[PDB]
Write a protein that binds this ligand. Structure first.
Ligand SMILES: COc1ccc([C@@H](N)CCO)cc1
Lengths: 237, 300
């Protein structure tokens, strides 16, 4: 079935599952042509495939060459996403294959279902949550690897850095979604927050700064203030 | 012209013969139906005055034997039977036609409706979908389920329609996932027409038989089959031009013949709006689209 606030802790049980987000697969700049018409120019994209229990992120980089000579790109993008996800499952040993894949947009259900017909025991599910994974390109090191790529390429990250050494996956996923929700509502403010203090650094093998527990609590409070703030600034409340 | 004689009518019943139907009162002196046109399949069907639950009936072709109906008071229904003694069948029928205890199949001479609804339907194919090989006629009723319905439970009493499934390995070639799902030509032409049905006549015949079972018996599984087979053609970019033209006629007569008051249950809003306004063949069903829009503008 669909995933929502009520079966929310299923994410953190011991059945392997992945979230798939396609909102950054097909990305364009829209510009004026010499004749005064409008044209698009594609830039590199990525498929965001995330195991929410372990933090493993399978970042499939989508090089702009994949769109060359193709029509109806927004529709192809969902099928390209499904093809890459199916290839990833096929590449994993059987005991690492997911038992469920949860797509963050319902338009992905049919493309993935068709690409996964060989895997009748993998359940493909939508969700009612408004998850902020489109803001993953606001994470500097992820945006950097996508923009620099010159060919199709997959890069493996742990989007939780070393957090699971200290907190649970439930709490780790809640931190991540709070960070991404903030980056999505006001990217500049959110980034000012994470990096204002020069003494806190990002380890070379990490995506986020090395905060102490007490500093994370202060950070998380500031992201909540932001997300509430911009909600007044937006709704005049 | 052939005759379906009845031993008696012990229970009040609405009798259908093809697209016609008439009331028979309990123990009225009724002894069957005459002047039934040779050359076509026919269906004779029944709805008891008491239990409007379960419409049921029999597909048959008079060329294949002498058939009669007799009420069975143990099983509680009008049963079709075969009389092999032809001489003995003749003396039963003549006697009834002399005493004028029969209704006449009431075909108007301008009317090709029944032909147009059964053009491709053939008893040999009906008997493969309705498996019961000791009889030359085939029983259907409202409640029978299809073979695909039993996959999602008695196999003997099932409708063995051809399974159509747009998200199946049979429908989708490896490496052509997007192509084959958005343009079903491969599945229609190679899998179904070439592989399974052999020709489009056998395909149209199953489609027509599915519609008729949906209309006459309100068989839900047949309606699903009828819609699936339409949708498969409408979602194929490459269809033989003769099939499109023939499909438009076939659907035209089906829509024409549907009871206006059953449109809400027998007509799937999504399939028809897709087929008429979105699909590859959205411009190729001119007759069907004109009658649908003038008769059921609601569903659209
Ligand atoms: C009303 O038509 C009928 C009625 C009875 C028969 C016979 N088979 C019955 C004797 O076994 C045949 C036809």
């Amino acid at each position: 079935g669909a995933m929502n606030s009520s079966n929310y802790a299923e994410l953190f049980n011991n059945d392997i599952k992945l979230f798939v987000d396609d909102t950054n697969v097909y990305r364009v700049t829209v510009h004026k042509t010499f004749e005064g018409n409008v044209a698009t120019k594609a830039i590199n994209g990525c498929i965001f495939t995330l195991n929410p229990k372990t933090g493993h992120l399978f970042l499939k980089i989508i090089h702009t060459s994949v769109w060359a000579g193709q029509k109806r790109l927004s529709q192809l993008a969902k099928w390209k996403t499904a093809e890459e996800v199916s290839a990833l499952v096929r590449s994993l040993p059987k005991e690492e294959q997911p038992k469920q894949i949860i797509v963050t947009r319902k338009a992905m259900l049919d493309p993935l279902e068709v690409h996964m017909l060989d895997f009748p025991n993998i359940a493909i599910r939508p969700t009612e949550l408004r998850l902020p994974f489109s803001a993953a390109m606001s994470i500097d090191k992820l945006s950097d690897v996508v923009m620099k790529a010159t060919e199709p390429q997959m890069v493996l990250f742990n989007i939780y850095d070393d957090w699971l050494d200290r907190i649970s996956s439930y709490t780790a996923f809640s931190r991540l979604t709070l960070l991404l929700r903030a980056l999505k509502t006001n990217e500049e403010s959110a980034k000012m927050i994470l990096l204002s203090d020069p003494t806190i650094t990002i380890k070379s093998y990490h995506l986020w700064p090395s905060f102490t527990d007490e500093q994370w609590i202060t950070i998380e409070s500031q992201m909540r203030d932001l997300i509430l703030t911009e909600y007044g600034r937006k709704y005049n409340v | 012209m052939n005759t379906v004689p009845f031993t008696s009518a012990p229970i009040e019943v609405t009798i259908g013969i093809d697209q016609y139907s008439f009331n028979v009162k309990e123990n009225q002196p009724f002894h069957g139906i005459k002047d039934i046109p040779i050359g076509h399949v026919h269906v004779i069907h029944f709805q008891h005055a008491d239990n409007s639950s379960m419409r049921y009936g029999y597909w048959f072709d008079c060329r294949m034997g002498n058939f009669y109906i007799q009420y069975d008071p143990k099983d509680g229904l009008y049963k079709m039977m075969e009389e092999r003694d032809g001489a003995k069948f003749e003396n039963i029928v003549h006697n009834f036609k002399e005493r004028q205890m029969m209704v006449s199949y009431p075909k108007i001479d301008e009317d090709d409706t029944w032909y147009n609804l059964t053009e491709f339907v053939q008893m040999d194919k009906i008997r493969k979908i309705v498996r019961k090989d000791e009889n030359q006629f085939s029983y259907v009723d409202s409640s029978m389920t299809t073979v695909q319905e039993n996959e999602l439970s008695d196999p003997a009493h099932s409708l063995n329609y051809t399974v159509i499934n747009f998200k199946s390995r049979e429908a989708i070639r490896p490496g052509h996932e997007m192509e084959d799902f958005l343009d079903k030509s491969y599945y229609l032409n190679t899998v179904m027409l070439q592989g399974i049905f052999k020709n489009s006549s056998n395909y149209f015949g199953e489609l027509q038989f599915a519609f008729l079972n949906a209309m006459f018996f309100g068989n839900y599984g047949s309606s699903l089959q009828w819609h699936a087979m339409i949708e498969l053609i409408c979602s194929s970019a490459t269809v033989p031009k003769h099939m499109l033209d023939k499909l438009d006629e076939i659907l035209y007569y089906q829509i024409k013949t549907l009871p206006e008051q059953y449109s809400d249950i027998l007509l799937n809003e999504r399939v028809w709006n897709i087929c008429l306004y979105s699909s590859f063949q959205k411009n190729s069903l001119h007759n069907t689209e004109k009658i649908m829009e003038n008769k059921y503008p609601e569903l659209l």
